Amino acid sequence: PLQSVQVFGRKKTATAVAHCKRGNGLIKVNGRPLEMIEPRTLQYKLLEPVLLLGKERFAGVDIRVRVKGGGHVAQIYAIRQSISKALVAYYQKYVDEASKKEIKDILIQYDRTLLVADPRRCESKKFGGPGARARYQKSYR
Amino acid sequence: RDKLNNLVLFDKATYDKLCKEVPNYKLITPAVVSERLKIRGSLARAALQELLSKGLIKLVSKHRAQVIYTRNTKG
Amino acid sequence: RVQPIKLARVTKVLGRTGSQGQCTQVRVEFMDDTSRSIIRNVKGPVREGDVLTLLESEREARRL
Amino acid sequence: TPDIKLFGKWSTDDVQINDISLQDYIAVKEKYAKYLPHSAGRYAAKRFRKAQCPIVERLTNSMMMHGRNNGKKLMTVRIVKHAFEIIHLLTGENPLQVLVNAIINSGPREDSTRIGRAGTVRRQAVDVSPLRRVNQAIWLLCTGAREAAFRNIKTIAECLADELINAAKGSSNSYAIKKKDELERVAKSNR
Amino acid sequence: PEKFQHILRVLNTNIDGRRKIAFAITAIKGVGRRYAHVVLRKADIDLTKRAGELTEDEVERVITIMQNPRQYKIPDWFLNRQKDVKDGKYSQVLANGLDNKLREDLERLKKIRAHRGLRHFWGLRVRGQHTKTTGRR
Amino acid sequence: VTVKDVNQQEFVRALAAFLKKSGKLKVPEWVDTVKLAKHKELAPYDENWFYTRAASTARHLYLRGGAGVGSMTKIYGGRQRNGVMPSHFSRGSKSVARRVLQALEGLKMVEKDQDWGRKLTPQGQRDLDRIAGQVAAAKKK
Amino acid sequence: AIHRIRITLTSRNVKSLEKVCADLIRGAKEKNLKVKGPVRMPTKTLRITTRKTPCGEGSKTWDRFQMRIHKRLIDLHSPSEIVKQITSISIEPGVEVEVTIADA
RNA sequence: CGAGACUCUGGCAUGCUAACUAGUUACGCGACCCCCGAGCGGUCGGCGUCCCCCAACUUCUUAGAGGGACAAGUGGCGUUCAGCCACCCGAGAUUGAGCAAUAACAGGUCUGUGAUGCCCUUAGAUGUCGGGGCUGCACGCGCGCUACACUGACUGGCUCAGCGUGUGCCUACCCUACGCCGGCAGGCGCGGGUAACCCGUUGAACCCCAUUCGUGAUGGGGAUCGGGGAUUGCAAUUAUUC
Numbered sequence A: 001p002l003q004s005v006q007v008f009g010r011k012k013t014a015t016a017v018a019h020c021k022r023g024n025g026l027i028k029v030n031g032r033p034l035e036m037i038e039p040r041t042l043q044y045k046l047l048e049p050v051l052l053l054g055k056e057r058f059a060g061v062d063i064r065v066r067v068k069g070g071g072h073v074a075q076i077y078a079i080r081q082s083i084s085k086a087l088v089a090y091y092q093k094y095v096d097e098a099s100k101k102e103i104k105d106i107l108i109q110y111d112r113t114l115l116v117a118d119p120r121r122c123e124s125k126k127f128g129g130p131g132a133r134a135r136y137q138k139s140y141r
Numbered sequence B: 001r002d003k004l005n006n007l008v009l010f011d012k013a014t015y016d017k018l019c020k021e022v023p024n025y026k027l028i029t030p031a032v033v034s035e036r037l038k039i040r041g042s043l044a045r046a047a048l049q050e051l052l053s054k055g056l057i058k059l060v061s062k063h064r065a066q067v068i069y070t071r072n073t074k075g
Numbered sequence C: 001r002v003q004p005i006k007l008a009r010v011t012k013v014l015g016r017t018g019s020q021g022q023c024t025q026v027r028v029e030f031m032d033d034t035s036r037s038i039i040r041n042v043k044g045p046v047r048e049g050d051v052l053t054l055l056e057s058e059r060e061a062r063r064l
Numbered sequence D: 001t002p003d004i005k006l007f008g009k010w011s012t013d014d015v016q017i018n019d020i021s022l023q024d025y026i027a028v029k030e031k032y033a034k035y036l037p038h039s040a041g042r043y044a045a046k047r048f049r050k051a052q053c054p055i056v057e058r059l060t061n062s063m064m065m066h067g068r069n070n071g072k073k074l075m076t077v078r079i080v081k082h083a084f085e086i087i088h089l090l091t092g093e094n095p096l097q098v099l100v101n102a103i104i105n106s107g108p109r110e111d112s113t114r115i116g117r118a119g120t121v122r123r124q125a126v127d128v129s130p131l132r133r134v135n136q137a138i139w140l141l142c143t144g145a146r147e148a149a150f151r152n153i154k155t156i157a158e159c160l161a162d163e164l165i166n167a168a169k170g171s172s173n174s175y176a177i178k179k180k181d182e183l184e185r186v187a188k189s190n191r
Numbered sequence E: 001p002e003k004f005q006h007i008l009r010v011l012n013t014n015i016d017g018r019r020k021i022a023f024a025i026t027a028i029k030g031v032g033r034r035y036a037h038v039v040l041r042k043a044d045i046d047l048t049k050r051a052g053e054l055t056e057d058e059v060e061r062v063i064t065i066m067q068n069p070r071q072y073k074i075p076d077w078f079l080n081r082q083k084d085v086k087d088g089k090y091s092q093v094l095a096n097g098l099d100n101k102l103r104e105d106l107e108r109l110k111k112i113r114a115h116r117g118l119r120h121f122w123g124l125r126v127r128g129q130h131t132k133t134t135g136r137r
Numbered sequence F: 001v002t003v004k005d006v007n008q009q010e011f012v013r014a015l016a017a018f019l020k021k022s023g024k025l026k027v028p029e030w031v032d033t034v035k036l037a038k039h040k041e042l043a044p045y046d047e048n049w050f051y052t053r054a055a056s057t058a059r060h061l062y063l064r065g066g067a068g069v070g071s072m073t074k075i076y077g078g079r080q081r082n083g084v085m086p087s088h089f090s091r092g093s094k095s096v097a098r099r100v101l102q103a104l105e106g107l108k109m110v111e112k113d114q115d116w117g118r119k120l121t122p123q124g125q126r127d128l129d130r131i132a133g134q135v136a137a138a139k140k141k
Numbered sequence G: 001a002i003h004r005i006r007i008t009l010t011s012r013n014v015k016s017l018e019k020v021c022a023d024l025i026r027g028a029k030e031k032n033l034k035v036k037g038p039v040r041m042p043t044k045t046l047r048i049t050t051r052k053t054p055c056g057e058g059s060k061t062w063d064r065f066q067m068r069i070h071k072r073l074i075d076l077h078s079p080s081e082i083v084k085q086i087t088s089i090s091i092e093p094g095v096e097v098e099v100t101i102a103d104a
Numbered sequence H: 001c002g003a004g005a006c007u008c009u010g011g012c013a014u015g016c017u018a019a020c021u022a023g024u025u026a027c028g029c030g031a032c033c034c035c036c037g038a039g040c041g042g043u044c045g046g047c048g049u050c051c052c053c054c055a056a057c058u059u060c061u062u063a064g065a066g067g068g069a070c071a072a073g074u075g076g077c078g079u080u081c082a083g084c085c086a087c088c089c090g091a092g093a094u095u096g097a098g099c100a101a102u103a104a105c106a107g108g109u110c111u112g113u114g115a116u117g118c119c120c121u122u123a124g125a126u127g128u129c130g131g132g133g134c135u136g137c138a139c140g141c142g143c144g145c146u147a148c149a150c151u152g153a154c155u156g157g158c159u160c161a162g163c164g165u166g167u168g169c170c171u172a173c174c175c176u177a178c179g180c181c182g183g184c185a186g187g188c189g190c191g192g193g194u195a196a197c198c199c200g201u202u203g204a205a206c207c208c209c210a211u212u213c214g215u216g217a218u219g220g221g222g223a224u225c226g227g228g229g230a231u232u233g234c235a236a237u238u239a240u241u242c
Helices: A044-052 A072-093 A097-110 B013-019 B030-036 B042-051 D055-063 D073-091 D095-106 D130-149 D156-168 D175-188 E021-025 E033-042 E056-066 E096-111 E115-122 F008-022 F050-063 F069-076 F095-107 F122-138 G014-030 G080-088
Strands: A004-010 A015-022 A027-029 A061-067 B057-059 B069-071 C006-017 C023-029 C037-042 C051-054 D110-114 D123-127 E008-010 E013-015 F079-082 F085-089 F110-112 F118-120 G003-011 G044-051 G062-078 G096-100
Touching (some): A044 A072, A044 A097, A061 A072, A072 A097, B013 B042, B030 B042, C023 C051, C037 D123, C051 D123, D073 D095, D095 D130, D095 D156, D095 D175, D110 D175, D123 D175, D130 D156, D130 D175, D156 D175, E021 E033, E033 E056, E096 E115, F008 F050, F008 F122, F050 F069, F050 F095, F050 F110, F050 F122, F069 F095, F095 F110, F095 F118, F118 F122, G003 G014, G003 G080, G014 G062, G014 G080, G080 G096
Parallel strands (some): A027 A061
Antiparallel strands (some): A004 A015, A015 A061, B057 B069, C006 C051, C023 C037, F110 F118, G003 G062, G044 G062
């Protein structure tokens, strides 16, 4: 057995659970590197925390992630939140506070809400329109 | 609106014109070449693909919708 | 007729005038002069301490 | 990367704001440098929020307009990245510096607001906020690029690049410049 | 950058570069986009090219396969008229000869006084669907 | 590795070429005049695509515990133009997809196994990995 | 021998369902049977949509009624009759309780 | 009294109690075993199936009880009040429904009602079967839908979901994985599932990608018409539909 914490990331619907366990591998998202996946037109965004905080930190732990829910963009945002949170979570209970705190400093300043949850989930549709707040055309003499 | 067509035959003169006008360009796309000549846009594109095996033009995009060529390294 | 361009910086957003309420009174410190400080109306949303580029102090911009 | 956060194949360094009145609504490195623009996809949450959004991100957002093209950011990001490359070949330089210059030159100074005067068509000469000047500039430039592309061979990327360069140093072949000269001229006149 | 090959005839129209071969052919009746595309595939001709490209040879090879469709394994379902009403076969109809048959069928069902015939002749809509505020302006 | 780690577009192209070398794909007496799917407004450009589809199907089956015609038909499926009515999802040709499953089985790329439909053969597992290696060296995108 | 028995409980009324479930669990263990503990299954929202207006002129007003059926099961393992016996007694109205011979 | 308050839903609980019609973790991981990479190799990491425990858990999934928002803390302002503004934490005093008073209206409904008054008709029906029309178009109006393209038409390929639902039903009946055949429509054989078991790891579309076409009513657009195949019904003529 090997040491392990789990965390999650949440944008809209699309939970992304990261299991951050002792070892060396990649960050893998659905078993494949961050580089792949596709749409890969947003690609730099999910690379971003890893580059900011060095790859040495995220290679002291193997990070494997299972993503379901939402769509392609929803998932990207979710994964980014879970990986950064993962690293911090692992260091917070096992390694040391100063490392996790340093990561929290670097992220929170430019900010991207990777340690606090997004509130925004779908607003309910109400009748008498074709949309949620969109409403049918009226006609008048 | 509008009505505009280009030659849709692959021609002699316009290919020669292209290669001998080459210092003018630093940006080359199909659309530009098409406008500046009378070559189609489709056969603008294709002329560039030929041209790239001189290597007076260098790929710097390879996107599906349309491609972007440079002239030499950077001009 | 003509005067030189004066940079003037928002000192205090006075409030909103206009018939529809879509004209904002502003007092702008004339910046070149601290003695002058004149009221000009700004169409846009105004955040204090941002800078206008006055092309005139002619044709005074005022409540309506 | 944490030393300076670059754009996704261009630098955020050597971008200069050539006006002292348009400051603090033009930024790209004054905290707001990004490899890939995206904040959280809200920008209407606070009235404060607009300051957070840099000129680059605002330009990508304003582009997606006209029903089919609405709500497709991914398409726009690909088009915009291509557009930067087209600018770089055409003038050398840094494409972001070209963008900044274009905004400054396209932004109006005086404009007009409606004022009553006998029921005759007269208006009051007013200066406008630098936030408004940036917002209007970005609008003009995006609308210009789209308008050209519609019934011409050139794509949105190419037309956007052409639109920025012409505005950056005047040529009178940029829509934004032509519109601005009309707004400022009319302002000066009036009652 | 090859001109040289230009001005091809398919049936009664001059076919030159404008569009890809397949689309270029569809000036004539009885050849849609799909028809001309499948004829070219059968005739072993790259259809991405122009019709100002390719010689007279290739054109004739296309014409033979279109007008003998079964005998070159263009199936019966793919045909504009299957079993027909005049002819006991299965015929691909092309050019001016389609116009002929269309006229024939409309006259035919005016004689026989079938509903399709009568409606079309009178200018009423042949399909039973609404024509209440449509089929005009 | 899983096949997902390496470049997906390059994988299917490399595998498709490997299939051509084998010299058989048990090809239909159709696919030279076909409608194909009803999501198509123009008949296929070439008769080449059958190899590409076969490679794609092999990859898709490698992922799953076993699957048949239904899985392939939805992936290849898209938007169907309904004329002047709203465009909606559908599933296109089933003869081709069935034929591809049969042909791959014949070569022993995939074989019938538990959880219904065809699942990968160890012969196929070996083949896919060899082209995976070639792809892995080439890029990652 | 112990026999695997499945008790399904179906209802619509949370509080009633919940305190039936309570009684089954508590009385089960009291004279020794398996405790387990409830496997909550997703409540199913039956939705009916109707026009609010007879005779439709005015505005489009729609009324939507829901009815939320709630399911749970509990798998007890212990011997034959004394399971289903001690469980199913001490309840009469208004919460369905099914004891099933299913599971081996 | 109405509204507020209230209730219900959406968001914040790695705290609480649970889960074999639900999953996850975590070994030991072996096999199918590929070497893809490391290691000489055993072994380690790996999408899935399979090994499964007297494993562990509720993180994703589920639904129960609990807490969290009160302008609370702090700072300005105000009759120093009621309240307002900013700031922290962060779901911020920013979610969406449900909810209707006093009273009016000749609003609509006798065709929802074996609720109903009077009137008509009633064995010669206005109580039932056979057939046609509502679907007829020189024209006016409204809600829509499809469009006018290159963020697209085209040909390959990548790939992620959610609310809900189903047969074995009190006047009539399902979703289909999976085999085969057919371009297609469709035909045909199985098996499971009143169901978070099976359909459905809901691997949907947008999206992403390499081309082709090249802004040209062009291949955008699919109107109108002609020929043919099938599906539904005992009956489709006035295209039921595909």
